[PDB]
RNA sequence: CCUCGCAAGAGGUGCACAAUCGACCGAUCCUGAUGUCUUCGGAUGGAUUUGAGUAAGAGCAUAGCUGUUGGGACCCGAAAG
RNA sequence: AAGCUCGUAUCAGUUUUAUGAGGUAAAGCGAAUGAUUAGAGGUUCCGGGGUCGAAAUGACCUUGACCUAUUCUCAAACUUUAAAUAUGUAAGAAGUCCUUGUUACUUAAUUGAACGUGGACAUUUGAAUGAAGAGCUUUUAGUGGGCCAUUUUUGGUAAGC
RNA sequence: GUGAUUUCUGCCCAGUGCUCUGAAUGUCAAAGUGAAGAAAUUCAACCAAGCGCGGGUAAACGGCGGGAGUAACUAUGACU
RNA sequence: UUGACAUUGUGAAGAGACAUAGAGGGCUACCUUUAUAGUUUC
RNA sequence: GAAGACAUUGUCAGGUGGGGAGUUUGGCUGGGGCGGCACAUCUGUUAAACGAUAACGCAGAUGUCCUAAGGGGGGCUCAUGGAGAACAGAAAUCUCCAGUAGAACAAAAGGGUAAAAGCCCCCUUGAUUUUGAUUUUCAGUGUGAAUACAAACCAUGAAAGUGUGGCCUAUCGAUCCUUUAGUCCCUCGGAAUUUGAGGCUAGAGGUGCCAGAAAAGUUACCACAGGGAUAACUGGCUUGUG
RNA sequence: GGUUGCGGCCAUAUCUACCAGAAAGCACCGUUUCCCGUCCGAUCAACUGUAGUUAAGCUGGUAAGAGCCUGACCGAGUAGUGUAGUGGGUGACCAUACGCGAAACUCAGGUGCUGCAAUCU
RNA sequence: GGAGCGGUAGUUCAGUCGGUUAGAAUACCUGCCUGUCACGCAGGGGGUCGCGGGUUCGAGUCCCGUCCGUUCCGCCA
């Protein structure tokens, strides 16, 4: 009678901004229109009647390069949103990895890690034993972050 | 720098210079707010009932 | 949140004016295109020196957008919109929740 | 105001104005009958809606007080361009 | 300020009669929520401890809890109970009564309700007291930096804070 | 830029710059090319240098941390 | 600074992208190609 | 001589460009600065028993979650204590007794509630449409929320009733512009046809300095208007601190 | 006056323990095929009031009862506050004039009322 | 005085901001190798994650209080 169903997507969402004086070590900030995690945080006076600035230094989550910024602290630096998927890792096929959500096993994607830490995972796979590997979807960027393995489950 | 913010002082005396105006009730209060169903019916009453008070007199 | 793919609601098509089945599409922004009065009237003010005039926007705070359901009837197929309160995670998917069966893991 | 009443009062006639309730014009929403270069035309009535509406019409012009806006605008006053 | 419609109208920073709502001062925790003292009685096999008994849902001491009945003193964010002060309304003729008509609402039913007809109650027509008038409208200045006292009260050690 | 002579000019190219006869098919305009379209126009397609990516350079700007444990007096603690 | 156009005129000699057709691959997303009829920046 | 149709020169287009220009640089705030947000909103108290009522007074919260934790109907009714049943043992389940509720109602706090406003079960989507009236804050304008109805159309239910979001109190923001739908209705003004654009109705795309300007700094080289409403020296009450 | 059905004020009606109750009338009690619904006919439905009780719920009575309601010139006109004063008090606060008026403690007392319909030795 | 953050076996650190399994290293233990001890081998054990409380079905993985231990401000006169 009618068809094609026009399947699309979900609506809304965003990356919530905050006041830039509340940021903390291992806070998450967008500089360069790129996500980051703080490492060095610094505040200062300007001169006499100081309206205090803040000079952060933040090392990327994804790329890894060390970035910096300086702004007065009231005006917002918009904060990205972060989540762990806690995926379980089955065999790594081609250049991708293959991750199994508990509910569903789809989505091998995730490129496999650029990470040097992902090399120990690359090394320890053939030895096996439940590979439970978290990733983060922050701003639609997803790459392997940490390796973890349970000790039992039989 | 602080300014006196909110106080009622010398208010309840001002209002009593004009002496607390009254609502001015009327005959035939406005039927605004009454349900339409009782109001639609009521239209046909005054409309018609004047006739026996008008046409019957001749 | 979640919403049903199919909904029986009121449909005014002048041919029915009675509750009918509705397939629920989700609303879509759409291309701003061109030729719209707000475009000609604008770029005519952008050309020449002086640069940006129509004020730029910065301060965005709100993280959410009211999700607009685009409804379609299955008979006369009118399209009547509908609004929902703001939500961060939306889906039209199915699989309605169970009785509270044990939370897994 | 008039009639009656010595008067007090009673009856009628009640403009102005106030309070509602209708009526007619427009908009929006229903009806859409008759007829229809069959598809257009709209009669007829309705609608918790609506107007800076009609309902035997009142304005124009000049001068004047006062009040606003624009103008060097109550007088004087900048550092700048 | 300009006036206008009216002139005893309807009101009145007011009392009384009747009837409302309010939870603060107080009071109480041998009434709950919260604290909180000190003793007395039971209890545990489902509290450790102690003596005696291989042993224990063992005889009796042990503190911790309780549970029982008392007592101590309380509470801006506790409460059965509950003040004066201030507050709401009514005190009618745009009333009541009798009788009767109108309707596309309402009902077992012109039964109702909303109004209207016609008559009865008129100046003790229906609480006290008063009213250099009562109501209405236009329009426009000037002000929008406050202070102090008695009472009530917050922060503060206290302040001509 | 330093500032006579004597002596010495250390460690850090991640940052910020400057640079590369540096890869190049990520970014990537006008113009130009094809298709749609009755036509404006839409679409892409390819697409300059830079950005991007990698290369060096500190007499370029600049920078140079903690906390533990230990010696057959104590204390320290070379050393781990 | 880089790109197109124009002043700007005569010539040239090879390369590739894109077109079809057949093989070599894994109906093909292509692929190494290759013969053919063109557009092309160079 | 070179140099060669390339350079240059002219017009456009992208890059670069504090060298250069213009311009800003919140507000509250028991001086201003940092700090905090009391600059929207909610719950209890401070309020002095109607209402009203303040302070960088106190105690706290939000800018989300739910097609369901909504809507109706039906059944049962809790936390807890007591008593008891192999593995079991405070915490594994069961059965009975006591049990106005000492629990649970998305998320603070206070209400409210038991043959239910809680637990489970059946069906559902009135978290729809037209479009006004009214309370709330009040200018008695808005936004937001809430009630009460009409006109429907429906769900549920034996029915009567109930139901236009979430048992109640907070969960959201204007014109211009863009964009979707509805009317497929009205214009393109010489006259026509179709694409295009403009319009009406109702939404959504953000203004959290939350009735809504697109904006960083320093000036002991500073400038001018002013200020004791706004500090330092001095005096006065004040007495902690001496 | 007893009982039932529907109620209205809603603890002068509830709690706890005992003791009663003729007549009918409720009530407890009996079977599962059909309709129905649960793990289970105990709940619920269905079927006769038969087979039997008044043990239980039900109503009433009893309890120097716990409660609750009322009252008592009992506590107390005491706490508290309106008004007013060049009244006192170093102040805190306290008296007075005009007025209002609590709670607890105390004692005394009560312990369901009542509408319609039917039926009952 | 303000405010900010840390508090994990032996010790240094992750998890630690995002709750329903506390992970590494070295330390210490075992057995071997050596004549013993080094070293290398095969294994191994160990921490309510500083306390009180409260949410949360569940908290090092939340909130408030302590406890200690960090910091930064401390300027115009």
Kind and range of the H or E element at B40? helix B36-52
**Inter-residue contact A19 to A74 (CB < 8 Å):** yes
Q: Which residues contact A45 (CB under 8 A, 6 or more apart)?
A: A52
Answer positive or negative: Cα dihedral of A53, A61, A25, A78. Answer: positive
Residue A35 CA and nucleotide H139 C1' are separated, in Å, by: 49
SS3 B36: helix
Establish whether the CB of B38 is closer than 7 Å to any nucleic acid atom in strand D.
no
SS3 C44: helix
CB burial string B17-33: b at 16+ within 10 A, e below? eeeeeeeeeeeeeeeee
Nucleotides of chain J touched by protein CB (<7 A) = 4-5, 15, 17-18, 20-21, 23, 57, 72-76
SS3 A123: helix
C64–A12 C-beta distance less than 8 A:
yes
Q: Which of C20, C61, C72 would you mutate first to test chain A, the one with the most A CBs within 10 A? A: C61
Residue-level length of chain B = 58
- Chain C's closest residue to A7, CA to CA, is C25
Q: Which of A12, A18, A79 would you mutate first to test chain C, the one with the most C CBs within 10 A? A: A12
Backbone angles phi and psi of C43, in degrees to 5: -55, -25
Nearest-CA neighbor of A39 among A61, A17, A15? A61
Alpha-carbon distance of B40 to A50, in angstroms, equals 72
Token pair for A121: 């995972």
Nearest-CA neighbor of A101 among A110, A89, A116, A118? A89
**Inter-residue contact C54 to C38 (CB < 8 Å):** no
Alpha-carbon distance of A110 to A107, in angstroms, equals 8
Partnered with residue A47 across adjacent β-strands are none
What single DSSP character describes residue B16?
A: G
* Burial group, residue A139, by CB count within 10 angstroms (0-12, 13-18, 19+): middle
Other C-beta atoms within 10 Å of B4: how many? 6
The Cα-based distances of A59 to C61, C67, C91 in angstroms read: 25, 36, 34
SS3 C41: helix
Establish whether the CB of B32 is closer than 7 Å to any nucleic acid atom in strand D.
yes
**Inter-residue contact C84 to C70 (CB < 8 Å):** no
Alpha-carbon distance of A51 to A53, in angstroms, equals 7
Nucleotide nearest to A85 (CA to C1'): J18
Other C-beta atoms within 10 Å of B15: how many? 10
Token pair for A86: 């806690």
SS3 C104: coil
What single DSSP character describes residue C66?
A: P
Q: Measure in Å the smallest separation between the Cα of C33 and chain A Cα atoms.
A: 21
**Inter-residue contact A147 to A121 (CB < 8 Å):** yes
């Amino acid at each position: 009678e009618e068809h094609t169903f026009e399947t699309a997507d979900a609506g809304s969402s965003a990356t919530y901004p905050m006041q830039c004086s509340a940021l903390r070590k291992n806070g998450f900030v967008v500089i360069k229109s790129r996500p980051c995690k703080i490492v060095d945080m610094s505040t200062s006076k300007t001169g006499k009647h100081g309206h205090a600035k803040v000079h952060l230094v933040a090392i990327d989550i994804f790329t890894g390069k060390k970035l910096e910024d300086l702004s007065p602290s009231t005006h917002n630096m918009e904060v990205p949103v972060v989540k762990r998927n806690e995926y379980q890792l089955l065999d790594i096929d081609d250049g991708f990895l293959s991750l199994m959500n508990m509910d569903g096993d789809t989505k091998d994607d995730v490129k496999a890690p650029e990470g040097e830490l992902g090399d120990s995972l690359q090394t320890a796979f053939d030895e096996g034993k439940d590979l439970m590997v978290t990733i983060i979807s922050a701003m639609g960027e997803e790459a392997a972050i940490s390796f973890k393995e349970a000790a039992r489950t039989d | 720098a602080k300014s006196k913010n909110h106080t009622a002082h010398n208010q309840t005396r001002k209002a009593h210079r004009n002496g607390i105006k009254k609502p001015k009730t009327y005959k035939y209060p406005s039927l605004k707010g009454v349900d339409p169903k009782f109001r639609r019916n009521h239209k046909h009453a005054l409309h018609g009932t004047a006739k026996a008070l008008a046409a019957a007199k001749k | 949140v979640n919403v049903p793919k199919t909904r029986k609601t009121y449909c005014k098509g002048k041919t029915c004016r009675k509750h009918t089945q509705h397939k629920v599409t989700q609303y879509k922004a759409g291309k701003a295109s061109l030729f719209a009065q707000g475009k000609r009237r604008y770029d005519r003010k952008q050309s020449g020196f002086g640069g940006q005039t129509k004020p730029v926007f910065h301060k965005k705070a709100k993280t959410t957008k009211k999700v607009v359901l685009r409804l379609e009837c299955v008979k006369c197929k009118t399209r009547a919109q509908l609004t929902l309160k703001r939500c961060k995670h939306f889906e039209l998917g199915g699989e309605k929740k169970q009785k509270g069966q044990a939370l897994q893991f």
